[PDB]
mmCIF file of C-alpha atoms in Angstrom:
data_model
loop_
_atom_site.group_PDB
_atom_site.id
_atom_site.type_symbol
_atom_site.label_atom_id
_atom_site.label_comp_id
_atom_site.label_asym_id
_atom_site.label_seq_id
_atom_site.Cartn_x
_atom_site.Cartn_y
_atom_site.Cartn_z
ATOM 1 C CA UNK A 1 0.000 0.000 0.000
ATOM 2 C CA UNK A 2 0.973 3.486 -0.703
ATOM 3 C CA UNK A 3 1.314 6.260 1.679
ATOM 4 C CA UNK A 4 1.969 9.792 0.938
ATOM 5 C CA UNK A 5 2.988 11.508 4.358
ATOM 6 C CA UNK A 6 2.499 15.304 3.249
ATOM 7 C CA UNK A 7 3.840 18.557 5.650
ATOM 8 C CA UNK A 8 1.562 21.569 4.904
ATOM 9 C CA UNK A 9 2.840 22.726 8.545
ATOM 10 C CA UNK A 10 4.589 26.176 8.233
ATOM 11 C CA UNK A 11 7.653 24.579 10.341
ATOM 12 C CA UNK A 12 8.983 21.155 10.117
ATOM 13 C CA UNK A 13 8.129 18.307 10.937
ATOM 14 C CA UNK A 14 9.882 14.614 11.277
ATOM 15 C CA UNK A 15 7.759 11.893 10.287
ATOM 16 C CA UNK A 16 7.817 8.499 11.422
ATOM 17 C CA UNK A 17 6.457 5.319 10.800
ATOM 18 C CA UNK A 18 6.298 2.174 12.459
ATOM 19 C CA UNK A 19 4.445 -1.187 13.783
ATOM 20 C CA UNK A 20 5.876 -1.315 17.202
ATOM 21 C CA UNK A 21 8.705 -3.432 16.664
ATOM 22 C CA UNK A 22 9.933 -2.541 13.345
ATOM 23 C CA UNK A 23 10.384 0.555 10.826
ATOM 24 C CA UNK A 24 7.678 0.775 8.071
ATOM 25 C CA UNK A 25 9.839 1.603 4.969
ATOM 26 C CA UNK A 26 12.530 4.148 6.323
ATOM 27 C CA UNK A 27 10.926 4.152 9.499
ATOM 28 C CA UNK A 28 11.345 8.702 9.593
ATOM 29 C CA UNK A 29 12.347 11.347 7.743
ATOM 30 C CA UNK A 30 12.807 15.492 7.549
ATOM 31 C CA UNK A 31 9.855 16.900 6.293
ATOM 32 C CA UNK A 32 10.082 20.751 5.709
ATOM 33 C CA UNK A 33 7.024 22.987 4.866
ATOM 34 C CA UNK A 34 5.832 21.671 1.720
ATOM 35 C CA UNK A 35 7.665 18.526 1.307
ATOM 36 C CA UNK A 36 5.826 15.114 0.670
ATOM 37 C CA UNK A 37 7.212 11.576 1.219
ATOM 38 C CA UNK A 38 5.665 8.279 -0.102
ATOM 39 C CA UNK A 39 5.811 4.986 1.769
ATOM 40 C CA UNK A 40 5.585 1.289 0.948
ATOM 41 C CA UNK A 41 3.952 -0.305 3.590
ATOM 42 C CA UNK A 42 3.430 -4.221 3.218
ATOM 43 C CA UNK A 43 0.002 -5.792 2.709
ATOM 44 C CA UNK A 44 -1.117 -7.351 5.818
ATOM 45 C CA UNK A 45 0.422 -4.958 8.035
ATOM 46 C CA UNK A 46 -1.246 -4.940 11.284
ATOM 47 C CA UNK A 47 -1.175 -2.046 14.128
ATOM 48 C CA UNK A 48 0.850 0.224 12.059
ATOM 49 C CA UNK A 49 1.259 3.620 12.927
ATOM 50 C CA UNK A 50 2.362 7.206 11.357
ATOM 51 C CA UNK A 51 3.024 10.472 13.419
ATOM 52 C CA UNK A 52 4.645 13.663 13.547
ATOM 53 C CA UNK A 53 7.964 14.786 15.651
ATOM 54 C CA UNK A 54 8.539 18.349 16.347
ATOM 55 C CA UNK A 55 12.243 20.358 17.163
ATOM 56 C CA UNK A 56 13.953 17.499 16.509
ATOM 57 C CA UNK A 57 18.052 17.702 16.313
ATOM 58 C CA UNK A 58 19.880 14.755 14.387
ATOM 59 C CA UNK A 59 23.551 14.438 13.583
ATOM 60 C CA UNK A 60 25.174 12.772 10.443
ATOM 61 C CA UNK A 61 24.303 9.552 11.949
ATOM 62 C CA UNK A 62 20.841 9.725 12.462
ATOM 63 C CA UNK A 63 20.878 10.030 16.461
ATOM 64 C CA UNK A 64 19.637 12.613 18.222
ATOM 65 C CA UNK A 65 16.469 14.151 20.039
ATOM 66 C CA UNK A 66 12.834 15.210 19.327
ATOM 67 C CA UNK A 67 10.816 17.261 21.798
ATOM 68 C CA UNK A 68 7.451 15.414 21.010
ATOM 69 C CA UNK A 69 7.029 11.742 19.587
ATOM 70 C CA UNK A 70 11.167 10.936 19.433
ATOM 71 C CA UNK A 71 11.154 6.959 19.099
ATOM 72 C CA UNK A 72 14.559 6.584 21.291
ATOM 73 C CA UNK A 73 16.494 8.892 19.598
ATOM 74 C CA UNK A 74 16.826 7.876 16.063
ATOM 75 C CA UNK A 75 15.436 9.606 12.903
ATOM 76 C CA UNK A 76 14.340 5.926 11.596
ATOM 77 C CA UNK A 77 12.123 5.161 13.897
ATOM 78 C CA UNK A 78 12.212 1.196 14.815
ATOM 79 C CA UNK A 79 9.645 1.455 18.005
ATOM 80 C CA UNK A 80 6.704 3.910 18.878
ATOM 81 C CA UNK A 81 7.572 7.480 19.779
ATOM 82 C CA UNK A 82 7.149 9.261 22.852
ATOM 83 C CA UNK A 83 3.725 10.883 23.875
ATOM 84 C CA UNK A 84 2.627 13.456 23.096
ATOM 85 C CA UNK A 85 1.832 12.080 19.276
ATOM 86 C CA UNK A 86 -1.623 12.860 16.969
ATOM 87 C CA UNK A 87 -1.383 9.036 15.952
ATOM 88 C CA UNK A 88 -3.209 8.407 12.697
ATOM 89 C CA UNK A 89 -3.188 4.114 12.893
ATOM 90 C CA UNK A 90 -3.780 1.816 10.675
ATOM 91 C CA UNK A 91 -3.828 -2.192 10.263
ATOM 92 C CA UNK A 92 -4.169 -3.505 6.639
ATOM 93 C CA UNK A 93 -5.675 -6.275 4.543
ATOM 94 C CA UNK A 94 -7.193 -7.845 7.491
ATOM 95 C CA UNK A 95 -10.260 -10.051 6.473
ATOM 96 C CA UNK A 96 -10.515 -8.529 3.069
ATOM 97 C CA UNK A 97 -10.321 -4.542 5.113
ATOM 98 C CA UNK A 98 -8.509 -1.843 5.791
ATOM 99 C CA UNK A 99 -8.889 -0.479 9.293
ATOM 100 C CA UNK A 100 -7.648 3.300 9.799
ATOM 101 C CA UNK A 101 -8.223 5.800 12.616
ATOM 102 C CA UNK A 102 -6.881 8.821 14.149
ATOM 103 C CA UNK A 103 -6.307 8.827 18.102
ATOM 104 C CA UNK A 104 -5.455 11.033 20.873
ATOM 105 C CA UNK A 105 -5.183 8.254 23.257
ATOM 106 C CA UNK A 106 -1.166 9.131 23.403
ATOM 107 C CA UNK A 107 -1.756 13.220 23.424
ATOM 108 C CA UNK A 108 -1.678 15.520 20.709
ATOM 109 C CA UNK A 109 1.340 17.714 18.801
ATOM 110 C CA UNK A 110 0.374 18.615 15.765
ATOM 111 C CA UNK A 111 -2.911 18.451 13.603
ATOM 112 C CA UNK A 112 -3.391 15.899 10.871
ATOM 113 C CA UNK A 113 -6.114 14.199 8.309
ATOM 114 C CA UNK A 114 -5.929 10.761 7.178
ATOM 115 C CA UNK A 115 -7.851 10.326 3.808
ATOM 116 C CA UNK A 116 -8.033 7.376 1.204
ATOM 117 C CA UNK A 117 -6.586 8.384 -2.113
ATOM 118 C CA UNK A 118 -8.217 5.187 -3.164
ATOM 119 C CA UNK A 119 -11.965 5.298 -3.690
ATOM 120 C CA UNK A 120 -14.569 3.514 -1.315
ATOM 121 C CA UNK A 121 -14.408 4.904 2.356
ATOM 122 C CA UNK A 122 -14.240 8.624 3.910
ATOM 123 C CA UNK A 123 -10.943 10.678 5.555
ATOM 124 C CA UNK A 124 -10.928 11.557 9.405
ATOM 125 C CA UNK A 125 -9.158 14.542 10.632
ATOM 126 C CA UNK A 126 -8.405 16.072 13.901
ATOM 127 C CA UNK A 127 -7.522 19.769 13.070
ATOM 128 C CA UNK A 128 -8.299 21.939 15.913
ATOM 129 C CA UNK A 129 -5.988 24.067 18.152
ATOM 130 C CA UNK A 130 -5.618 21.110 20.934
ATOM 131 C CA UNK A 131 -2.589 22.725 21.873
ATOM 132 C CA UNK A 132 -3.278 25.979 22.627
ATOM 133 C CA UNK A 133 -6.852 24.835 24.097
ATOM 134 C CA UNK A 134 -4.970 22.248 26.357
ATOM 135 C CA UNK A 135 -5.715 22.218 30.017
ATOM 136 C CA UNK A 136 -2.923 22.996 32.339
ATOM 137 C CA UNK A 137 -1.823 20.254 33.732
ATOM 138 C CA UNK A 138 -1.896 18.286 30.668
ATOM 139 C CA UNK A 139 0.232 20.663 28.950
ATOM 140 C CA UNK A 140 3.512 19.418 27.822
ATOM 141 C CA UNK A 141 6.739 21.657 28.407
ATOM 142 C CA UNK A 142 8.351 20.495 25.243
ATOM 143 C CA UNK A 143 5.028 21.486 23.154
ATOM 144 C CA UNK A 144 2.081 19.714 23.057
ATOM 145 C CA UNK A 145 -0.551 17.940 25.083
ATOM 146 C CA UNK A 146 -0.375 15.377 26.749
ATOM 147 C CA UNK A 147 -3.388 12.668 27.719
ATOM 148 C CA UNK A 148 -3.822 12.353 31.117
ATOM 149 C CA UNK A 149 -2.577 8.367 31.212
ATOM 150 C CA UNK A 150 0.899 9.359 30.352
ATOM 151 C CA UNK A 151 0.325 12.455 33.226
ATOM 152 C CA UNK A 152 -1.253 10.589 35.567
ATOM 153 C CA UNK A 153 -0.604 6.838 35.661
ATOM 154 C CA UNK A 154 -4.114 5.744 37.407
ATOM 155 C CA UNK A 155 -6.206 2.773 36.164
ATOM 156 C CA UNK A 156 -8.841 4.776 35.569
ATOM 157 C CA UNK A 157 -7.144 7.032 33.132
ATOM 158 C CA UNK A 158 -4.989 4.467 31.655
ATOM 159 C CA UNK A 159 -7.757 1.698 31.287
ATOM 160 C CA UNK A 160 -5.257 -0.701 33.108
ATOM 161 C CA UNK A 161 -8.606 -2.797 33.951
ATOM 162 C CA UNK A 162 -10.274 -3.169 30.882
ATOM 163 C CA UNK A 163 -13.287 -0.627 32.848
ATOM 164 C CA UNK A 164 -12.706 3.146 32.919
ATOM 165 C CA UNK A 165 -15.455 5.737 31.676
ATOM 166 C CA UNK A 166 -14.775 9.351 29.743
ATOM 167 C CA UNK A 167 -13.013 11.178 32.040
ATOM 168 C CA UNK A 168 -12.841 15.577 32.577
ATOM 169 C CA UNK A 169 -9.147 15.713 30.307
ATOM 170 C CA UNK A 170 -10.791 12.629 28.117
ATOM 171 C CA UNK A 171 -13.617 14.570 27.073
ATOM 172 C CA UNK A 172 -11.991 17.725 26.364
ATOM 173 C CA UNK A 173 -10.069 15.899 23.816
ATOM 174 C CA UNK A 174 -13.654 14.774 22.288
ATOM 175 C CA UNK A 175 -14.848 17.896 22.247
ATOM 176 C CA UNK A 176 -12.354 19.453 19.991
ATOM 177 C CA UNK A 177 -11.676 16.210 17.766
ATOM 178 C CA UNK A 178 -14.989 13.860 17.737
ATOM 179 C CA UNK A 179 -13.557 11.880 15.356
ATOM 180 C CA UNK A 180 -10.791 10.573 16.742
ATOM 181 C CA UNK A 181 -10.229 8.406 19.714
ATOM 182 C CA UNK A 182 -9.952 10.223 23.276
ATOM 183 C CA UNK A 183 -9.608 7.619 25.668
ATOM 184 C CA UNK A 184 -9.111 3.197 25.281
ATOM 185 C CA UNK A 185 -12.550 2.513 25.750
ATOM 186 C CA UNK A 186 -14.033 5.406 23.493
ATOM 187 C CA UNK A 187 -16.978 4.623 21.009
ATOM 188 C CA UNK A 188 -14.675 3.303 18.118
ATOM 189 C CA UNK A 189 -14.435 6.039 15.506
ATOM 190 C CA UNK A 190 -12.387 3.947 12.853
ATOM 191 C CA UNK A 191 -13.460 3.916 9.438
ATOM 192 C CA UNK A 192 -13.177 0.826 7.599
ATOM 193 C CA UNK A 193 -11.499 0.567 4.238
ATOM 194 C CA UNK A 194 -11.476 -2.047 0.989
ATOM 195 C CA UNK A 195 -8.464 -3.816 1.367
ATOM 196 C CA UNK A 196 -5.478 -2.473 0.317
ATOM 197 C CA UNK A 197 -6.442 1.114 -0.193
ATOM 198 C CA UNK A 198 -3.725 3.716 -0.682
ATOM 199 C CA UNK A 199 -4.161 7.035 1.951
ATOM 200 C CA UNK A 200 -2.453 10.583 2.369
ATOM 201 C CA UNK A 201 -1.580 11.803 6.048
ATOM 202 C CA UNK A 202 -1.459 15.200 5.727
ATOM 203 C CA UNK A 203 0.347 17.190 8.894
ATOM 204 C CA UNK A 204 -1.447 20.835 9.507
ATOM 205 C CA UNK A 205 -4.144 20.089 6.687
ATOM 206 C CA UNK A 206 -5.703 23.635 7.746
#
């Protein structure tokens, strides 16, 4: 499947993609204002996940540091990045499908809509200004905002039981993007695909 990863942010950005325990294609890369970067990403691949890193600093080897979603330092990301990440997800060719989502369940840095260039299903997008909205004590020194698992570290927020409800910081992250997810147990809002769709994330689509 194809993926164009496009920035329309005025500053840049450092994609990423991964499944968790692997790179998908290069696994990162600089993206400046403007600049577009297509994928591969292998048929069946299940759990997959794209996001954005922001003031990141690299050196000729590809080590360095992000302040939002760096995936243990490297620019090809092998593993997922640190919260907080916009996470547009994905798992393909499963049962004839395509499953994709955006979720907030990790925090949010920077806005983003995931569309089908493909025909046959609809785009979700989570757009507005999270971070400037943010509640204080979610809000993330580095930039961003966080969700209140990675803040808090109680059952209830993290879902560590399998039973938690919408919480206060859960449901402000609902109210300003309804279609994506804002806490583990939220009303699913994925979209479901034909199997082996191609899609566009695009960074700052506003």
């Amino acid at each position: 499947a194809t993926f164009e990863i496009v920035n329309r942010c005025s500053y840049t950005v450092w994609a990423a993609a991964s499944k968790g325990d692997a790179a998908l294609d290069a696994g990162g890369r600089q993206l400046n204002s403007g600049e577009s970067w297509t994928i591969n990403v292998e048929p069946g691949t299940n759990g997959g996940k794209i996001w954005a890193r922001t003031d990141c600093y690299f050196d000729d080897s590809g080590s360095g540091i992000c302040k939002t979603g760096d995936c243990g330092g490297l620019l090809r990301c092998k593993r997922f990045g640190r919260p907080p990440t916009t996470l547009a997800e994905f798992s393909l060719n499963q049962y004839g499908k395509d499953y994709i989502d955006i979720s907030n369940i990790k925090g949010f840095n920077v806005p983003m809509d995931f569309s089908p260039t493909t025909r046959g299903c609809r785009g979700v997008r989570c757009a507005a200004d999270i971070v400037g909205q943010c509640p204080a004590k979610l809000k993330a020194p580095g930039g961003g905002c966080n969700d209140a698992c990675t803040v808090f570290q109680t059952s209830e927020y993290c879902c560590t039981t399998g039973k938690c409800g919408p919480t206060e910081y859960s449901r402000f992250f609902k109210r300003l993007c309804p279609d994506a997810f804002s806490y583990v147990l939220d009303k699913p809002t994925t979209v479901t695909c034909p199997g082996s769709s191609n899609y566009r994330v695009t960074f700052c689509p506003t």
